[PDB]
Design a protein around this ligand. Structure first.
Ligand SMILES: [Mg+2]
Ligand SMILES: [Mg+2]
Ligand SMILES: [Mg+2]
Ligand SMILES: [Mg+2]
Lengths: 180, 190, 40, 457, 256, 226, 107, 213, 251
RNA sequence: AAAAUUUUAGGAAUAGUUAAUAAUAAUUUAUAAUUUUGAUUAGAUUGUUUUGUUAAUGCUAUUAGAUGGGUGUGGAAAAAUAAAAAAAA
C-alpha cells in the first residue's frame, strides 16, 4: 500500500504481518558464521530487533568434532556434530497457540530435532511425486476405516483435553465423613 | 573481545567462548568548538555559547536521575508514576481550574544525595471548592483541556482563614508585593 | 509466484501483459495433483 | 477463600447435579449455604445495597501502612449485596435434585418438603434485574443495511432484522426461573425433579435410551416401574398440595417433562402420550371450578407426542446377518401412521402452535420407519426450503431411499440429496456419509473429498 | 485556526449506540454536552429517593427549623423576589410567600387513623433527641433544584453548625422511621438534605406554568449569598394553608 | 475467514489459496468478491484482418463524395458482421435472431457444458440498449438440475462466448411471464431416465490416461526420446 | 464531602454531588457573571433555532463546509495532538509558521 | 428482545413491593467524569466507568434518548448519494410528539436537514402530533423515521439535486444553495473538498440488499 | 473483515464513509424485484394456516386526516376487482417488471394483472396484483384462503399499500415468514380418507442383483479454464456451495 | 492522555495566544497563560539497557532512526534510488 513500492524486499499483506520463525545472521567470512532462530514479524525494519517476538536459539552450521565427550570407539558417535539450541516452550507456544509461519531452513532444523516432520522442500530426487486416482483411494479407505467413536475419542485426546480422571482419583477427591 | 590486549587480537568477527560483544565507540576524539561569532555580538539576549556544549539527558554529568522514592510514593501506591500528587493550591483565576504546586525528587549518584524540585499543574475542580492555599490530593485522568490532565481528588487541608476571608468579600490571599525581577531601575516616587 | 507457462492462453494486447493465466485442462489436472500431495 | 454468593452456589450445584456427585454438594452446602433463609412477611424484600464503598479519611490516608490502604476489587466485600435479592429457593431446589441424583430419599424428602412448605406459605421474593455483566444491555442500531432475506437467490438467508428460516429447536416459552410466583416455582420444581429422574435413568442405562442403536431400546427396563411409581406419587403430591391455585399458572413445561418421562423410562406409544396429556389437562381444568375452555397442548408437548411416535416405529439397522432391519415386536405401521396423521391434523389445526425443525424430524422419522415412501414429499414440501436442518433428516431419508424398487432411483435420489446438502448449507455429517459409504459396491456413490482420501491413505 | 484542530471538548464516543454503526451504516449526531453538563452547572441536587410504594402517597407532615423574625434570609429572599418579578412576572405564582419560609429537615406521611398516637410519640422522641442540642447557626448561599427543576431552593452550606444538624436529624430519622415504623419518604439509615424552598411548581399549576422552572430566572442568584441565621426552634408541621396563615403546627421543641 | 481452503493451515503462504475467502477481504472494496470470470482480453480482441480490403465508412460521414458502390457497401456490411462474430457470439447477437428475443431459451457458455461442469441460463427478459451487442440480460441460473428461485442479471452477457438451441416449446410471448424451470429434486420428482446427475458434492472425475502419460513423461517416469 | 472515592475513582466533587452537599467558596463577581452567562446557553439556543431558522442555517453552512476545508480533515495522533507546537518543535521555524514559540502552557 | 422484558418485568415487580426501605445514596454512587483514556465515552445510565459488581435497583428512565432518522443527499465526486443521518435527543419520558419535533429541530447542526416541514413516523405510519410517547410504546430501541415534504417527489429528477457531472449549473443557481456553498469551479487548495467514491465502486449495479448477479 | 468499533476519525456532522441507504423507487422494475418473493411466501402462508388481517370483506375506508397513519404497510386480499378510490391507475406492461412474478405465477396462482396505483396527492402507493384461477398449491379447509371464493368468480386480488421512495423495510413483508406445514401428503392416512386401505408398507429393502448403471466415461474439457476454483475461492458453480468442496467444476 | 531525567561563563521577558462554556465565538465570557525554582527566541546537539580508563562514589563515549498541511487512499502515512525480509503452484 506504499505509493512507490520498496522493490527489493516485498511481502504478502500489511506489515507487521503474522509472526514467522526465521534463521538470520550477519554476513561474514564463512569460517565464523552463526545463525539465529527467531520468532519475529513478517515485515522487518533496519535492525531486526524492532520487531522481534522471541529468541529461539543459536545454530552453528559447522560440523564439529566432539571434544566434550571422551573419544569413543563407537562408530556413529565419532561422526562430526552439529550444534543447535532450541527453546521449545516458546516454540510450542508460538507455533501451537499463536499459529506462526515457518521459513524452510528452520523447518529442516526442527525436523532434525524431532519437533516437526521433514519439510516440503526436502526432496530425494530419486523418487517422483506420487499420482492419485479417487476410486483406488476409495477401495483402500473402505478396506480400512476405524470406528466412529474410536476416531472421535482419538481426536478428543489429541486436540482437546489429554489429562482425564480415572474413577479412582474421583473417589479419592470426594469429601469424607464430617462434611459427607 | 574487550578484555584482550591490542596485540592479543586475532579475529574481529566473533566471541570464542562467551562474554560481552562490545563495539568500541571512540571516546577520545579531541572534538572541538568552532568559533563563529565576535565576543561583542552574540546573537542571544540571555545566554552566550563559547565552548563545546555537553549534550544528552541522563548522559549528562553529573547524572541527575528520577527518584521514585519520596513522600508521594511513600504514602501512595501509584498505578503509574505521577498518578498521584500532593500539593498546595496556588491561585484560582480560571473557572473550575485549580493550579497546584507540587514537589518531586531528583537523585545525584555522584554525591549520593537528593534534591526536591517543584512543578505546577492544572487540576480540574468541578464545583469550585478549592481556595488558594489548600492542601490537595491530585490524580491523573482523562484529557480535559489542552493542559489539564489532573483532577482534584480530595481536599486534605482546606483553608479556613482564606474561606472566611472570602466570605467578607476580600481576596483569599493578599496579592504579592513585587512581580518578577527586572534588569532596569524603576524610579517611581510618590 | 504463480507460475505462468508458455502454453497458457496468450493474450494479444499491446496495452498490457502478454500472457493471461488461463490453463490448458492438462495444467489444471496437474496442478490439482501436486496440490493434493502438499495437502498430504 | 472467596465466599461464593448465592448465584455461584447455584452454578456449582448445577455442576453437581449433572455430575450426579452428592458428596460435592454436601460439603458445599455445609460450608456455605446453611444460614440461607427464605423471605417472610416480616422480611423486607429486596434488601438495599448497604456497602459504604471504600474511601479514606485524610488520617486514614496519611497514617496507615501501605497495605491497609490497598484496595483490589475483592469479591468478598460485596457478597452480602450480591445476596440481597434472595435466590434461596433455587439453592433448595438444586439441593433436592442432588439428593435425588445421589440416590438418597430421606434428605431429598427433607429439602423438597422445606421448599414446598415455604412456597405455599411465604411471599414471592422480588426478582433481580438482568445482570449487566453476564448478559449485555442491547445497544441501539438501525437495521437498514442488512443482507436481505432473499439476498442469496439460491436459498433463505436468515437476517439480523428478522428470522425467515423458522425455529430449529422448540423453546419452552417461559421467562427465566426467578420471575415466577411461588406457586409457579413449586410447579417448576416438580418438573425439575422429574427431569433429574430422567437424566439419572439415562446415565444408568445409556444403551436403552439411545434411539435404535440396539433392540434393547424397545423394551422397558426393570426398575422402570418403581421409577414411574415415584413420578406418579410426586405429581399427585403436587395436585394434593396446590389447590384451585393451579388453574391460574402455566403447566406447559411440567406436562412436556411428564410426557418425556412416560415416553423414555416407561415407554408409551404416541397414542398413549396424547391420551395421557389430555387426561392431565382435563384434570387441571376440573380442579379449577369453571366452564372449562381447556388450554390446548403447547408446541413442546406435541414435540414429545411426536417423538413418542418416532420411538414407536424405530428400526435397528444393518444386523450382522446382512438382514435388513429389526422392528419393535408387535408393530403395526397402519395404526401408527393413522394416529400420526390425525395428530398432525390436530396440530396444524391449532393456530398458536409454532413448528420447528425437530418436530418435522420426528414426523419424517416416523414416516421412514413406517415404510410410507412419502417421506420425501413431506420433507420437500414442508421442510427443505423453509428450515435449517441437521443431516439427521438425510440419514433417515437415506434409509427410505435404500428401499425403493430399482437401483438407479436409489443412486440418483441419494446424489440429489447430497446436492441439497451443498445448496442449503447442511454440512452432511459423518454418520450419514458412513451410511452412504457402506453400500458403495451397489450404488458407486463417492462420499469423501479427494484430499480427505489422500491424506487418509 | 484560533485553537486546537480538534477541540478537546468535542471528542465524544457514544457507547449506548451499537458497535460498527457509526463506522459504516450511519453517523449519529447530537449535542452531547447538554447531557454531560454537570450537577454543579445545572443546579440539580440528589435528594433521598423514595421507594415506589412510598412514592405513591402524598406527604402529610414534615420537620422544620422555624426561621426567627428579623432574618438576613427573609430580607434577601424578598430582595430576590423583587428582582425576579421585575425581570419576569410569570414567576408570581411559582414563588413562595416570604411568610412561609422555613427550613425543611425531612418529610413524612402520617395516616389519619393513628394520628394522635403518632403525633404524641413523635413529639416526645423529638424532644429527647434535641434535649442536648444548643441553638444552631447555619449559613445559606446558593440555589438548587429538586424534582427535575420543579422545586427551587436555598442550600444549607456544611461550613458551620450544620455538622450538628446532621447528627441531630439522623437521630430522629432513626427514631421516627426506625423505632415506630413511620413513612419517611426515604430510608431511615439515610440522611435528608435540608433546604429552604423558594419557588415551587405544584401539579395543578404545572399546566399553565410549564414542566420545569426555566434556569434563566435564577441563573444569576444561583450562587448568591443569603447569610447566617441562628435557630432555636424545631417544629413538626401538618400542611394546611388556611388555619393560621403559617403552616399548621402540630408540635414544637426549643433548642436552648 | 467465513470459508477457508482446508481450514486454516498455514505451512505455506500458497497453502491458503489465491484468495483467503469468497467474501471481499477489505470491507471498503466490495468488488473483490470472488466471481467466476472470463478471459475478456482474448474474447473481445476481434479480428481486424477480416476488415482488410473492405472500405468501411463511418456513421457521421454522410457526404455524397464519401460513400460508395452498393456492392462495396454490401461486402462492407458482410465484412463487419464477420468481424463481430469473429470470436464467438454475444448473447444479444443470439437473442435478436430468436423468436420473442429468445425468452425461455437456455443460454450456455462453452465451458459450462464440458467436463463435470453443467450449467445454463434460462432467459427471463432483455433490454437492448441502442447499440445491439450490448445491453442487460436477466434470467434463471440452472446448475446441475438445480434452479434459482428468482431471476438475476446474467453476468458477462457482453462477452462473446455464448451458445443456445432454439426450441418452440420454450418460447414465451412478451405478454405472458417466463416461468422458472423446475429444480429436479423438488418440483419434479427425480427420474433417472429423464435426467442423470453428472457430478455431486463429494464426487470428482477419474484420471484421463493421456494426462497421466504426459505427467509421467514430464516428471521423467516414462521415458521420452528425441 | 472532602474525600474522594478510592474504589470508585470519583473525585470529591462527585461524592459531594451524591450526598447532596455543596461545598463552594464564596464567588466574586467574575465567576458569578461567567457562570450565569454560561448557564443559559441552551435556552438562548432553543429560542434562536425556533424563532430564526435562516440565520442559523447560514452559520451551519459555514461550519459544515469549514469541516472539509482547513488543515486536518481527520483525527490522528498528529492532528489530535493537544499541544501541537510542543510535540513538534522541529517544524516551528521552517515548515509551520503559525506558532512562534514551542511552549504556551505549563506542559 | 429478552433483555427488554426481563428488565421490564423486574421493574414492575419491584414497584409492587409492599416492604422496601428505599436505597441509601451513599451506597449508590453516581458516575465519574474522570477515568483513564483520552476520549470521553458516554454510557448507559445503568452503567459506570468503574467496576461495579452489584446489580442496582431498576429505575424508570426520565430521559429517553430518542433517535430520529433522516435522509441526506451527500455529495461525493462521482455524483449524489442518498444516505442516512440520525439525530439524537434526550426527550423527557412523558413528552408530546409535537415537543419531540421541536427538540429534534433544535438539535440538528446540519444545514441540509430541517429546511421544510417533517413528519415523524414509525415503520411508515405517521404519529399523532397530539399524543404521548407512552401511548405509542416509544423506547430507545424503537425505530423512528422522519419524512419531509418533497421526499415523495424524490423519484423525479427535479427535487433531487443536480450533479454538475450530468447537469448544467448556471449563474442562476451558482449563487443559491448547496451548489453555491460547494464552489464547483476548482480552486488551488480545491475548495471544500468533498468525500469521493468512484463510479465502479459497486460495479455496474449500485448498492443493494439483494444480490443481483 | 469485521465492523470496527466506533468512528472517532471524522466529524459526525459530515458523515464520511457511509454505505448508501437503499431506497425503493416505484417507477422502476427494481420495486417488484424486492416485493415479489415476499408475496409468494405470503400467499403460501395463507394457503396453510390463517393470518388475521390478510382477508378483508370490503375495501378499507379511512378519512383524509388519518390516511397516512393507518394505511401504510397494510396488505389485504379481496375477492373481486375494484380499484381503491382516489387512485390514478398505471398498467405495468413493461416486461422487465412482470418478470419477477414468474415464480409466483407458475408455482402459485397465475398472475392475470399487475397495477401500480398512486394517490392524487402523490404521497401514497398501492401495488395491486390480480390472480386468475385456483391455487396451484393445495388449500387447507381451516386456512385463511379457504374463506375466499377466488380460490378453491375465479379472479381475486392482493392489495399492498406503501409510501414511495422508502427503504425496503417499511413495506412490511417480513412478519409473514411464519411457516406452517402443508398437510396434503398425510391427508392420505387420516381416518377421514378412504384411500388409506390402498396403502402398503415397505419395511425391508428388496434384494438387488444389479449395481447402478455406470456414468458415461469422462471427457476432459477442451477449452482454456481460469484455474483451480478452489484456489480462486469460487464456490462450486460460482453458484452455491462451499469452496472446500470443488464438485462439479470441470475436473 | 500523562509523570520523571534536559545543554550554553558572565541572564530578560515571551505570545493566533490560558480556562471555562460548545460538536459557538476572523468582536462568546473572565481579575487569563508561560518566565529569574532561569522562560521564549539564538548557538551547539540524533533523548533515558551499549565505550574507554580505573582498586574505586567518578571522569569519558554510544550511532541511528518519526521534518506540517493542500480529493485525505489505507487496519495504520511510514508513500518517489540507494534490499539482502522469498513476496498467494
Ligand atoms: Mg501537552
Ligand atoms: Mg528553528
Ligand atoms: Mg481477519
Ligand atoms: Mg506536500
Amino acid at each position: 500500500a506504499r505509493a512507490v513500492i520498496k522493490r527489493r524486499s516485498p511481502q504478502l499483506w500489511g506489515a507487521p504481518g503474522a509472526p514467522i520463525i526465521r534463521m538470520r545472521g550477519h554476513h561474514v567470512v564463512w569460517k565464523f558464521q552463526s545463525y539465529d532462530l527467531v520468532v519475529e514479524h513478517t515485515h522487518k525494519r533496519r535492525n531486526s530487533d524492532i520487531r522481534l517476538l522471541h529468541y529461539l536459539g543459536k545454530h552453528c552450521p559447522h560440523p564439529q568434532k566432539s571434544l566434550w565427550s571422551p573419544d569413543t570407539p563407537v562408530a556413529q558417535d565419532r561422526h562430526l556434530f552439529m550444534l543447535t539450541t532450541v527453546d521449545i516452550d516458546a516454540f510450542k507456544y508460538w507455533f501451537g497457540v499463536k499459529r506462526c509461519r515457518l521459513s524452510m531452513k528452520p523447518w529442516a532444523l526442527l525436523a532434525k530435532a524431532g519437533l516437526l516432520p521433514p519439510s516440503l522442500t526436502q526432496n530425494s530426487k530419486i523418487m517422483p511425486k506420487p499420482l492419485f486416482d479417487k476410486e483406488s483411494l476409495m477401495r483402500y479407505y473402505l478396506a480400512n476405516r476405524k470406528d466412529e467413536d474410536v476416531m472421535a475419542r482419538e481426536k478428543y485426546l489429541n486436540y482437546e483435553n489429554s489429562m482425564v480422571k480415572t474413577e479412582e482419583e474421583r473417589a479419592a477427591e470426594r469429601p469424607v465423613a464430617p462434611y459427607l | 573481545p574487550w578484555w584482550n590486549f591490542q596485540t592479543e587480537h586475532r579475529q574481529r568477527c566473533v566471541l570464542m567462548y562467551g562474554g560481552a560483544r562490545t563495539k568500541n565507540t571512540h571516546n577520545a576524539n579531541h572534538r572541538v568548538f568552532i568559533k563563529k561569532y565576535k565576543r561583542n555580538a552574540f546573537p542571544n539576549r540571555t545566554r552566550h555559547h563559547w565552548a563545546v556544549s555537553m549534550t544528552g539527558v541522563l548522559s549528562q554529568r553529573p547524572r541527575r536521575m528520577p527518584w521514585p522514592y519520596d513522600l508521594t510514593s511513600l504514602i501512595f501506591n501509584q498505578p503509574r508514576q505521577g498518578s498521584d500528587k500532593i500539593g498546595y493550591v496556588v491561585g484560582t483565576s480560571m473557572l473550575k481550574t485549580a493550579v497546584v504546586a507540587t514537589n518531586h525528587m531528583v537523585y545525584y549518584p555522584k554525591f549520593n544525595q537528593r534534591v526536591s524540585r517543584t512543578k505546577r499543574f492544572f487540576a480540574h475542580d468541578e464545583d469550585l471548592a478549592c481556595v488558594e492555599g489548600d492542601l490537595v490530593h491530585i490524580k491523573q485522568c482523562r484529557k480535559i483541556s489542552k493542559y489539564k490532565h489532573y483532577y482534584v481528588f480530595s481536599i486534605l487541608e482546606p483553608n479556613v482563614e482564606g474561606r472566611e476571608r472570602l466570605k467578607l468579600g476580600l481576596k483569599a490571599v493578599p496579592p504579592p508585593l513585587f512581580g518578577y525581577p527586572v534588569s532596569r531601575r524603576i524610579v517611581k516616587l510618590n | 509466484r504463480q507460475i505462468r507457462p508458455y502454453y497458457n492462453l496468450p493474450s494479444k494486447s499491446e496495452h498490457g501483459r502478454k500472457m493471461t493465466g488461463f490453463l490448458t485442462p492438462y495444467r489444471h489436472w496437474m496442478w490439482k495433483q501436486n496440490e493434493l500431495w502438499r495437502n498430504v | 477463600q472467596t465466599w461464593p454468593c448465592t448465584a455461584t452456589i447455584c452454578a456449582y450445584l448445577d455442576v453437581c447435579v449433572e455430575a450426579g456427585e452428592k458428596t460435592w454438594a454436601m460439603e458445599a452446602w455445609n460450608r456455605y449455604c446453611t444460614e440461607l433463609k427464605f423471605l417472610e412477611p416480616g422480611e423486607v424484600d429486596p434488601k438495599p445495597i448497604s456497602r459504604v464503598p471504600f474511601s479514606l479519611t485524610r488520617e486514614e490516608l496519611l497514617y496507615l501502612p501501605k497495605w491497609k490502604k490497598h484496595f483490589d476489587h475483592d469479591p468478598n466485600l460485596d457478597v452480602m449485596d450480591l445476596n440481597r435479592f434472595n435466590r434461596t429457593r433455587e439453592v433448595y431446589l438444586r439441593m433436592a435434585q442432588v439428593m435425588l441424583a445421589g440416590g438418597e430419599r430421606n434428605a431429598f424428602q427433607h429439602f423438597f418438603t422445606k421448599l414446598e412448605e415455604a412456597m405455599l406459605n411465604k411471599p414471592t421474593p422480588v426478582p433481580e434485574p438482568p445482570n449487566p455483566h453476564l448478559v449485555r444491555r442491547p445497544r441501539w442500531a438501525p437495521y437498514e443495511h442488512c443482507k436481505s432475506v432473499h439476498h442469496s437467490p439460491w436459498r433463505l438467508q436468515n437476517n439480523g432484522r428478522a428470522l425467515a428460516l423458522g425455529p430449529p429447536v422448540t423453546i419452552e416459552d417461559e421467562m427465566q426461573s426467578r420471575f415466577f410466583s411461588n406457586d409457579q416455582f413449586l410447579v417448576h420444581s416438580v418438573k425439575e425433579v422429574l427431569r433429574i429422574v430422567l437424566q439419572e435413568h439415562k446415565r444408568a442405562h445409556p444403551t436403552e435410551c439411545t434411539r435404535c442403536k440396539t433392540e434393547a431400546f424397545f423394551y422397558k427396563t426393570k426398575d422402570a416401574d418403581e421409577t414411574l411409581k415415584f413420578c406418579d406419587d410426586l405429581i399427585e403430591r403436587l395436585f394434593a398440595s396446590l389447590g384451585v391455585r393451579l388453574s391460574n399458572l402455566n403447566t406447559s413445561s411440567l406436562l412436556s417433562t411428564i410426557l418425556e418421562v412416560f415416553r423414555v423410562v416407561g415407554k408409551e406409544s404416541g397414542a398413549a402420550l396424547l391420551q395421557r396429556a389430555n387426561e392431565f389437562l382435563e384434570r387441571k381444568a376440573s380442579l379449577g371450578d369453571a366452564e372449562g375452555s381447556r388450554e390446548n397442548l403447547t408446541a413442546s408437548n406435541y414435540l414429545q407426542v411426536l417423538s413418542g411416535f418416532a420411538d414407536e416405529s424405530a428400526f435397528v439397522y444393518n444386523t450382522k446377518k446382512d438382514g435388513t432391519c429389526q422392528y419393535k415386536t408387535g408393530f403395526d405401521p397402519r395404526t401408527t401412521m393413522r394416529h400420526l396423521a390425525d395428530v398432525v391434523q390436530e396440530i396444524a389445526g391449532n393456530p398458536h402452535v409454532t413448528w420447528a425443525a425437530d418436530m418435522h424430524l420426528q414426523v419424517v422419522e416416523t414416516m421412514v420407519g413406517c415404510g410410507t415412501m412419502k417421506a420425501n414429499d413431506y420433507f420437500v414440501r414442508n421442510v427443505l426450503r423453509q428450515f435449517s436442518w441437521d443431516s439427521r433428516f438425510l440419514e433417515a431419508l437415506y434409509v427410505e431411499y435404500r428401499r425403493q424398487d430399482d437401483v438407479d432411483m436409489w443412486a440418483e435420489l441419494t446424489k440429489r440429496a447430497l446436492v441439497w446438502t451443498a445448496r442449503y448449507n447442511a454440512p452432511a455429517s459423518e454418520r450419514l456419509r458412513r451410511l452412504i459409504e457402506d453400500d458403495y459396491d451397489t450404488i458407486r456413490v463417492q462420499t469423501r473429498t479427494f484430499r480427505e482420501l489422500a491424506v487418509f491413505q | 485556526e484560533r485553537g486546537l484542530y480538534f477541540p478537546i471538548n468535542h471528542r465524544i464516543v457514544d457507547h449506548r449506540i451499537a458497535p460498527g454503526v457509526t463506522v459504516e451504516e450511519t453517523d449519529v449526531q447530537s449535542r452531547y454536552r447538554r447531557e454531560l453538563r454537570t450537577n454543579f452547572a445545572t443546579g440539580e441536587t440528589r435528594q433521598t429517593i423514595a421507594p415506589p410504594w412510598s412514592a405513591r402517597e402524598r406527604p402529610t407532615h414534615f420537620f422544620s427549623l422555624r426561621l426567627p423574625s428579623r432574618n438576613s434570609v427573609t430580607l434577601r429572599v424578598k430582595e430576590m423576589h423583587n428582582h425576579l418579578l421585575f425581570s419576569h412576572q410569570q414567576c408570581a405564582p411559582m414563588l413562595v410567600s416570604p411568610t412561609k419560609l422555613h427550613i425543611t429537615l425531612g418529610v413524612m406521611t402520617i395516616p389519619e387513623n393513628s394520628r394522635e398516637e403518632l403525633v404524641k410519640n413523635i413529639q416526645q422522641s423529638m424532644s429527647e433527641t434535641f434535649a442536648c442540642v444548643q441553638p444552631l447557626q447555619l449559613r445559606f448561599r446558593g440555589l438548587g433544584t429538586f424534582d427535575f427543576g420543579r422545586v427551587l431552593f436555598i442550600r444549607v452550606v456544611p461550613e458551620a453548625d450544620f455538622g450538628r444538624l446532621e447528627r441531630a436529624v439522623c437521630d430522629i430519622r432513626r427514631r421516627v422511621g426506625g423505632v415506630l415504623g413511620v413513612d419517611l419518604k426515604g430510608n431511615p439509615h439515610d440522611s435528608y438534605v435540608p433546604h429552604v424552598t423558594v419557588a415551587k411548581i405544584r401539579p395543578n399549576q404545572r399546566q399553565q406554568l410549564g414542566d420545569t422552572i426555566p434556569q434563566s430566572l435564577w441563573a444569576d442568584y444561583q450562587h448568591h449569598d443569603f447569610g447566617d441565621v441562628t435557630l432555636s426552634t424545631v417544629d413538626l408541621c401538618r400542611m394546611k394553608g388556611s388555619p393560621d396563615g403559617y403552616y399548621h403546627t402540630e408540635g414544637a421543641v426549643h433548642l436552648s | 475467514r467465513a470459508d477457508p481452503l482446508n481450514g486454516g493451515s498455514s505451512m505455506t503462504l500458497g497453502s491458503k489459496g489465491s484468495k483467503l475467502s469468497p467474501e471481499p477481504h477489505r470491507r471498503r472494496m466490495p468488488w473483490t468478491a470472488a466471481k467466476e470470470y472470463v478471459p475478456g482480453v482474448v474474447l473481445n480482441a476481434r479480428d481486424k484482418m477480416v476488415l482488410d480490403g473492405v472500405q468501411l465508412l463511418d456513421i457521421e460521414s454522410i457526404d455524397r463524395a464519401s460513400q460508395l458502390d452498393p456492392l462495396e457497401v454490401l461486402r462492407a456490411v458482410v465484412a463487419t458482421r464477420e468481424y463481430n462474430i469473429s470470436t464467438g457470439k454475444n448473447i444479444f447477437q443470439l437473442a435478436s435472431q430468436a423468436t420473442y428475443n429468445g425468452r425461455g431459451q437456455r443460454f450456455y457458455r462453452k465451458e459450462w457444458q464440458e467436463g463435470t461442469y453443467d450449467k445454463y441460463v434460462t432467459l427471463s427478459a432483455i433490454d437492448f440498449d441502442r447499440d445491439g451487442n450490448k445491453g442487460t440480460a436477466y434470467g434463471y441460473i440452472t446448475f446441475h438440475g438445480e434452479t434459482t428461485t428468482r431471476p438475476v442479471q446474467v453476468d458477462f452477457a457482453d462477452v462473446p462466448g455464448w451458445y443456445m438451441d432454439f426450441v418452440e416449446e420454450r418460447a414465451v410471448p412478451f405478454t405472458g411471464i417466463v416461468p422458472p424451470p423446475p429444480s429436479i429434486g423438488t418440483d419434479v420428482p427425480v427420474d433417472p431416465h429423464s435426467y442423470r446427475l453428472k457430478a455431486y458434492p463429494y464426487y470428482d472425475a477419474p484420471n484421463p490416461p493421456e494426462f497421466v502419460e504426459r505427467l509421467l513423461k514430464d516428471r521423467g517416469v516414462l521415458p521420452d526420446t528425441p | 464531602g472532602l474525600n474522594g472515592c478510592v474504589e470508585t475513582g470519583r473525585s470529591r466533587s462527585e461524592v459531594a454531588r451524591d450526598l447532596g452537599l455543596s461545598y463552594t467558596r464564596p464567588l466574586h463577581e467574575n465567576e458569578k457573571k461567567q457562570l450565569s452567562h454560561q448557564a443559559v446557553y441552551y435556552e438562548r439556543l432553543a429560542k434562536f433555532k425556533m424563532e430564526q431558522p435562516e440565520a442559523a442555517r447560514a452559520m451551519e453552512r459555514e461550519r459544515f463546509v469549514r469541516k472539509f476545508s482547513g488543515m486536518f480533515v481527520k483525527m490522528d495522533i498528529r492532528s489530535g495532538a493537544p499541544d501541537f507546537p510542543s510535540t513538534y518543535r522541529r517544524l516551528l521555524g521552517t515548515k509551520v509558521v503559525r506558532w512562534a514559540s514551542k511552549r504556551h502552557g505549563p506542559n | 428482545g429478552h433483555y427488554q422484558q426481563e428488565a421490564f418485568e423486574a421493574r414492575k415487580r419491584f414497584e409492587e413491593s409492599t416492604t422496601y426501605p428505599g436505597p441509601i445514596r451513599a451506597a449508590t454512587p453516581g458516575d465519574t467524569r474522570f477515568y483513564s483514556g483520552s476520549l470521553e465515552s458516554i454510557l448507559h445510565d445503568t452503567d459506570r466507568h468503574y467496576w461495579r459488581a452489584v446489580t442496582d435497583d431498576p429505575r424508570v428512565q426520565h430521559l429517553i434518548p430518542l433517535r430520529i432518522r433522516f435522509k441526506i443527499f451527500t455529495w461525493v465526486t462521482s455524483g449524489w448519494e442518498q444516505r442516512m443521518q440520525v439525530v439524537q435527543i434526550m426527550a423527557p419520558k412523558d413528552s408530546t410528539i409535537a415537543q419531540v419535533k421541536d427538540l429534534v429541530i433544535v438539535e440538528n447542526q446540519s444545514p441540509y436537514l430541517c429546511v421544510s416541514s417533517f413528519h415523524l413516523a414509525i415503520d411508515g405510519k405517521e404519529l399523532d402530533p397530539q399524543k404521548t410517547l407512552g401511548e405509542y410504546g416509544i423506547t430507545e430501541q424503537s425505530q423512528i423515521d422522519a419524512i419531509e415534504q418533497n421526499d415523495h417527489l424524490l423519484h423525479r429528477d427535479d427535487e433531487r439535486p443536480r450533479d454538475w457531472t450530468v447537469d448544467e449549473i448556471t449563474a442562476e443557481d451558482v449563487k443559491r444553495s448547496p451548489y453555491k456553498e460547494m464552489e464547483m469551479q476548482p480552486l488551488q487548495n480545491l475548495a471544500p473538498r468533498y468525500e469521493a467514491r468512484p463510479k465502479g465502486y459497486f460495479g455496474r449495479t449500485y448498492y443493494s440488499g439483494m444480490k443481483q448477479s | 473483515s469485521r465492523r470496527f468499533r466506533y468512528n472517532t476519525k471524522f466529524p459526525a456532522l459530515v458523515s464520511y464513509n457511509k454505505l448508501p441507504w437503499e431506497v425503493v423507487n416505484h417507477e422502476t422494475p427494481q420495486f417488484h424485484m424486492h416485493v415479489a418473493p415476499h408475496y409468494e411466501q405470503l400467499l403460501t402462508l395463507a394457503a396453510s394456516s390463517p393470518v388475521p388481517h390478510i382477508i378483508g370483506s370490503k375495501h378499507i375506508d379511512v378519512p383524509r386526516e388519518h390516511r397516512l397513519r393507518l394505511l401504510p404497510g397494510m396488505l389485504y386480499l379481496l375477492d373481486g376487482d375494484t380499484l381503491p378510490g382516489e387512485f390514478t391507475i398505471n398498467r405495468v406492461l413493461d416486461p422487465t417488471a412482470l418478470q419477477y412474478y414468474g415464480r409466483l405465477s407458475s408455482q402459485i396462482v397465475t398472475v392475470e394483472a399487475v397495477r401500480m396505483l398512486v394517490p392524487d396527492d402523490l404521497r401514497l402507493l398501492c401495488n395491486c396484483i390480480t390472480f386468475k384461477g385456483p391455487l396451484h398449491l393445495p388449500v387447507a379447509p381451516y386456512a385463511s384462503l379457504a374463506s375466499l371464493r377466488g380460490a378453491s368468480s375465479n379472479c381475486f386480488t392482493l392489495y399492498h399499500f406503501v409510501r414511495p421512495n422508502r427503504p425496503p423495510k417499511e413495506l412490511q413483508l417480513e412478519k409473514y415468514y411464519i411457516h406452517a406445514p402443508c398437510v396434503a401428503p398425510l391427508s392420505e392416512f387420516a381416518s377421514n380418507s378412504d384411500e388409506r386401505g390402498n396403502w402398503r408398507p415397505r419395511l425391508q429393502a428388496p434384494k438387488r442383483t444389479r449395481r447402478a448403471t455406470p456414468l458415461p466415461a469422462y471427457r476432459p474439457p477442451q477449452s482454456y479454464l481460469m484455474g483451480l476454483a478452489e484456489r480462486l475461492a469460487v464456490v462450486p458453480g460460482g453458484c452455491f456451495g462451499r469452496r472446500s468442496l470443488m464438485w462439479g467444476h470441470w475436473f
